[PDB]
C-alpha cells in the first residue's frame, strides 16, 4: 500500500444538455494542464441510450444496457437491423451497398453508425433527465485542478462551500448511480 492517497468524489456543475461535451472538454484540459494523474474518473450521471432513426425520423430510443436486442427498421430502400447487446451497437444486415454492415461497433455517447444507402442510423446519446447539469469526478482536489475545472468550456465549478469543493461519500455516488440504473 503506497499510492494510498485517496481521491474523493466531487460534483461539478456544468451546462445542462452539454454534460458529455463538458466531460470531453475536461478530459482535454486535464491532458493539457498535466493534471491527469490527479483524476481517476470522470462520469456523467446519465443513462446511455441508442436512438434509431430511419429517413431522418426517430423510431426507437432504447437503453444501451440490456440483455441483447435486435431492432429492424424500414428505410429508404429496405431493412436495416441493428443489434444492441454487451453495451455496444452494430449492424446485422442492411440493403445492398450499405458499408455500415461492417462498421465497428459503437458504445460511447456521440458515436453513430450511418447506413447511407438505406438512410437509417443508430446514435448513442445520454438521457439527462434525473441529474441535468452535473458530471462527477473522482479526484485529488487542489488549487490547480479547481482552477482548470472553472476554465473548462462547458463547466461551471464544483459544488463548493466557502470555495472548498464538497466531497461526496462513495455511498452517495453509488446511490445516484443507482438512480440512473434501477
Curated annotation (Swiss-Prot):
Keywords annotated in UniProt: Transcription, Transcription antitermination, Transcription regulation, Transcription termination
Entry superkingdom: Bacteria
GO CC term (a single one): cytosol
Keyword Chaperone: no
One BP term from GO: DNA-templated transcription termination
Family: Belongs to the NusG family.
Entry comment, domain topic: Contains an N-terminal RNP-like domain, a C-terminal element with a KOW sequence motif and a species-specific immunoglobulin-like fold.
Subunit structure: Monomer. Homodimer.
Function: Participates in transcription elongation, termination and antitermination.
Protein name: Transcription termination/antitermination protein NusG
Native source species: Aquifex aeolicus (strain VF5)
